[PDB]
Amino acid sequence: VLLDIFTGVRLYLPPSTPDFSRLRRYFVAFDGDLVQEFDMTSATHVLGSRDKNPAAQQVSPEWIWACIRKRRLVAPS
Amino acid sequence: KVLLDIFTGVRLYLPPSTPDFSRLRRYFVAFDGDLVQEFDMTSATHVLGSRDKNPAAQQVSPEWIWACIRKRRLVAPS
Amino acid sequence: MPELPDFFEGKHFFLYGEFPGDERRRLIRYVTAFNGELEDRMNERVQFVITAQEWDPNFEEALMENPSLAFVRPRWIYSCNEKQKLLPHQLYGVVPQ
Amino acid sequence: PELPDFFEGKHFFLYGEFPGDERRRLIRYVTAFNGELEDRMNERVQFVITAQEWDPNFEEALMENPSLAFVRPRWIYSCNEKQKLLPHQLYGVVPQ
Ligand SMILES: [Mg+2]
C-alpha cells in the first residue's frame, strides 16, 4: 500500500527547503531517491537551487504534491 | 574473590520489619547465606530476635551479621 | 494530503554492512515512510542497528559508547510494514554465535 | 565492606527452570551487586533471565512490557567474573 510515483527520480533536496522533512518523507515513501550534495551531477531533478546544475530538471515542492495527487509524474514546475 | 563465602550453611529467617532490612539481606546473601521464607520458617538454622516456634535454631542479631563480615568468618553468636 | 503511518517515530536507525539486491533501498523506504530517523554513521543518536550479517566485533566497540543499542534483522522492518504496526524488535534480534 | 553496585537500578526476573543451584547463584549475584529481583513478571521488570529456549510466553510479556530484554544466565556470571556491568546484548535470547 505504498505508491510507486517517483520511480527513477534522483532528486537533490536543499536542507533549507521549507517543510523539508515532510517533503523528504513522502518523496522517499513514494519511491524517489535523494542525492547527496556531493553527487549533485547524478541528480535528474533539483528543487529550488537552479545554479547548482542547469542541465537538470528544475522542480519545486508544489511539483512533489502535484505528482502525488495525480499519482504520476507531471511536468516539472 | 569479591564474594566472600562467610554464611555458607546458614539458613536465616530475616523479619521484613528488621531495621536496615535491605542492606542486611544484601550482604548476607552476597556472602553466601540463604534466606528462608516465612512459610518455611521452621526449617531455619538461625533466627533473628523475637523468634517463636523455632527453639533449636541459633539466636542471632544484626550485629552478628556485621561481626561475621568484619572477621570474614562466622563468629560466636550474639 | 496523504497520511502515512507513524509507527517508527522517535526511533533512530543505522543500516550496517551490506545488503542483498535492493534491500537497502527497501529498508530506507520503510524507515522513512513510517517516520523513523536514518543516521549516516553509527553516532550517539542511533538506537537500532539493522544488519543482515552475522554478529560483528564492531558491535561490541559501539556498545562501549552507546550501551543502549539494539541489533536487529531487516525482517523486523519488513514485518512492521506487512502488519502496519510497530512489532517488538526483540523477536528479530541479533546476538553473537 | 562495600559491595559493587553495577546492577543498581535494574530489575530482573528469573524465568523458567534452572539446573542445579544456578537459581541460588543468580539470586546471589543480582542481590550482591544491588540489582532488584521481582517475584513475578510485572511492569518493573527490565531483564528476563532464562536458560530455556525462546518462549511464546515472551511474546505475551512483550505486549505488557515492550522494553524487556531477554538474557542468558551467562551474562550475570560474566559480570561477576569481570566485576563490572557487561552489555547484556552479548548474551541475548532470540527466536529460532
Ligand atoms: Mg527501579
Q: Which residue has the cell 526449617?
A: B43
Residues of chain D with C-beta less than 8 angstroms from the C-beta of C59: 89
Q: Which of D73, D75, D96 is nearest to D19 (CA)?
A: D73
| Method used experimentally | X-ray
- Chain D contact present for B41, CB below 8 A: no
| CATH value at residue B78 | 3.40.50.10190
**Residues D86, A55: Cα–Cα separation, whole Å:** 55
CA quadruple B61, B66, B69, B71: dihedral sign: negative
Rg (CA), chain D: 13
The domain in which residue A25 lies consists of 1-77
Among B3, B63, B68, B71, the strongest candidate for a mutation testing the D interface, having the largest count of D CBs within 10 A, is B3
Q: What is the resolution of this structure in A?
A: 2.3
In angstroms, the CA D24 to CA D46 distance is 20
Element (H, E) at C12: strand C12-16
Candidate from C60, C69, C93 with C-beta closest to D94: C93
- E-strand stretches of B1-78: 11-13, 34-35, 46-48, 58-60
- Give yes or no for a contact between D49 and D73, defined as CB atoms under 8 angstroms apart: yes
Could you tell me which chains touch chain D, where touching means 3 or more CB pairs under 8 A? B, C
* Beta carbons of A25 and C35 less than 8 Å apart: yes
CB B13 within 8 A of CB B44: yes
Among D18, D5, D27, D48, residue whose Cα is nearest residue B35: D27
Scanning the structure block, which residue is given the C-alpha cell 542445579?
D20
Q: Which residues of A59-68 are buried (b: 16+ CB within 10 A; e: fewer)?
A: bebebbebbb
For residue A42, what is its C-alpha cell? 547524478
Q: How far apart are CA D89 and CA C89, in angstroms?
A: 13
Number of domains in chain B: 1
| Identity of residue A68 | I
- What backbone torsions phi and psi does residue B34 show, to the nearest 5 degrees? -115, 130
- Which residues in A21-46 are b (16+ Cβ under 10 Å) and which e? eebbbbbbbbbbbbbeeeeeeebbbb
Would an 8 Å CB–CB cutoff place C69 in contact with chain D? yes
Rounded CA-CA distance C78/C86 in Å is: 11
Q: Can you tell me the distance from the alpha carbon of C53 to that of D12, in angstroms, rounded to the nearest whole number?
A: 30
SS3 at position B43: helix
CA nearest to A60, candidates A14, A29, A4: A14
Residue D72, amino acid = R
Radius of gyration (C-alpha) of chain C in whole angstroms: 13
Q: Would you call C29 and A2 a contact, using CB atoms and an 8 Å cutoff? A: yes
H-helix segments, chain C = 23-33, 57-65, 74-83
Q: How far is CA C67 from the centre of its chain?
A: 16
CATH topology of domain C1-97: Rossmann fold (3.40.50)
Which amino acid makes up residue C76? W
Amino acid at site D7: F
CATH architecture of D1-96: 3-Layer(aba) Sandwich (3.40)
Pairing of strands B46-48, B58-60: parallel
